[PDB]
């Protein structure tokens, strides 16, 4: 009965990078989280501000969905109170977050014959990111006290690099797709409920 759209979110053709993640607002549908086809590559499941057992008995106003692709040894940075490079320059969660974090292996799609270069991530920045902020600036970074004048040199670098995903690798370098859900509840006629 007018199920929520989750087919194109979890079964898309190609995802985006981590510095340009997408954001889709789901509303006016019934939360029916039982048709995720079990996410065959053994998806993980961790919720912080909600309980997995009894969560279908709560009506929320709006539910946001974010999607990106990161490495294997960096999935632990998507959590409240975490430091690093993908938790301070690309994507950061607040201290009181209500939602769940999902991730599964995608080593059979995001890999081609001897080298795949189509995913980037920010390495240099001036200050840390506030929660829920996206930056798509491709300017040059100054690491000294002299102007750069828009040309790479000694103390002026480029803030983006590739990932080099390859099929033959370890269990800590294969790509993992991450989807973050956030629940919202305010003084509105909430319509997004569970199966009931």
């Amino acid at each position, epitope marked *: 009965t007018n199920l929520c759209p989750f087919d194109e979110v979890f079964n898309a053709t190609r995802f985006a990078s981590v510095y340009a993640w997408n954001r889709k607002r789901i509303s006016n549908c019934v939360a029916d989280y039982s048709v995720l086809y079990n996410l065959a590559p053994f998806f993980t499941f961790k919720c912080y501000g909600v309980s997995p057992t009894k969560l279908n008995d709560l009506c929320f106003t709006n539910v946001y969905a974010d999607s990106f692709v990161i490495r294997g040894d960096e999935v632990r940075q998507i959590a409240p109170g975490q430091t690093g490079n993908i938790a301070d320059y690309n994507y950061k969660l607040p201290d009181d977050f209500t939602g769940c974090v999902i991730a599964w292996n995608s080593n059979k799609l995001d890999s081609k014959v001897s080298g795949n270069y189509n995913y980037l991530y920010r*390495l240099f920045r001036k200050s840390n990111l506030k929660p829920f902020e996206r930056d798509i600036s491709t300017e040059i970074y100054q*690491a*000294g*006290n*002299k*102007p750069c004048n828009g040309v790479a*040199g*000694f*103390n002026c*670098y480029f803030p983006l690099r590739s990932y080099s995903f390859r099929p033959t690798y370890g269990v800590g370098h294969q790509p993992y797709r991450v989807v973050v859900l956030s629940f919202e509840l305010l003084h509105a006629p909430a319509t997004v409920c569970g199966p009931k």
Partner: antibody, heavy 123, light 109 residues
Framework: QMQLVQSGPEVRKPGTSVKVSCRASVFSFDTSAVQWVRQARGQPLEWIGWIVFGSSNTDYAQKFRDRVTITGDMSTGTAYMELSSLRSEDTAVYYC????????????????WGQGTVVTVSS | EIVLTQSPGTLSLSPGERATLSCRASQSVRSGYLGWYQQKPGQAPRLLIYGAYNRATGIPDRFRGSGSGTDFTLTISRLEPEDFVVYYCQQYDRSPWTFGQGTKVEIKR
């Protein structure tokens, strides 16, 4: 005092591989850089041979870039330099240089230097 | 590649005087990526002037930097003899970085 420790002397045959290291503590900040210079007896300095730890990007000279390679490692903080197909004209001292850098900002000039490494090619 | 040509090969003076050495270039370089060095024979070179205007830490207040555009010069204030050594210039602005030939200073007698 902030200094850069280097390797010891080594003698090689006419045509082989050689490896010289340059270990330091400031080489683990994702923004550090280090160049390689060479000075013979009497002759002045030679080249640049620089590398940036992080977004690894090499840039060699014209006579080189056919027999030299530079690598980096942030775990131990040690740089490396390899030179294959050695002839009897490379007998000189090799130096290591790097600027003082924080985790977010570097300096504006090469301040710290090294000691030197002697390479000889004979019997 | 940009080439540097230091004109004064040797420059003999007396302790307690003023010497002026220059290090010109062929093309035009940016006055933000020039550096001077000092090297004693049998030791490791150190940094003297970076940015062609700024001095390094610990360097005494007698080495003054000047010059811009295509011609750069280094002036000595008072020769208290501890610095009769070779000086070099470097231009780390383009992709191929080069050095100079060398200027040695000796004592006159």
């Amino acid at each position: 005092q902030m200094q850069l420790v280097q390797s010891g002397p080594e003698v090689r045959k006419p045509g082989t591989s050689v490896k010289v290291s340059c270990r330091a503590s400031v080489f683990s900040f994702d923004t550090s850089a280090v160049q390689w210079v060479r000075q013979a007896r009497g002759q002045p300095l030679e080249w640049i041979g620089w590398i940036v730890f992080g977004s690894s990007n090499t840039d060699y000279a014209q006579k080189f870039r056919d027999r030299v390679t530079i690598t980096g490692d942030m775990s131990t903080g040690t740089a490396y330099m390899e030179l294959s197909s050695l002839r009897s004209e490379d007998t000189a001292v090799y130096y290591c240089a790097a600027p003082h850098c924080n985790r977010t900002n570097c300096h504006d000039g090469f301040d710290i230097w090294g000691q030197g490494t002697v390479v000889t090619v004979s019997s | 590649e940009i080439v540097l040509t230091q004109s004064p090969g040797t420059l003999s003076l007396s302790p307690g005087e003023r010497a002026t050495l220059s290090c010109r270039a062929s093309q035009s370089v940016r006055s933000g990526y020039l550096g001077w060095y000092q090297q004693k024979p049998g030791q490791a070179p150190r940094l003297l002037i970076y940015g062609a205007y700024n001095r390094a830490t610990g360097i005494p207040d007698r080495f003054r930097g000047s010059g811009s555009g295509t011609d750069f010069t280094l002036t000595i204030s008072r020769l208290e003899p501890e610095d009769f050594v070779v000086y070099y210039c470097q231009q780390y602005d383009r992709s191929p970085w080069t050095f100079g030939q060398g200027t040695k200073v000796e004592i006159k007698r």
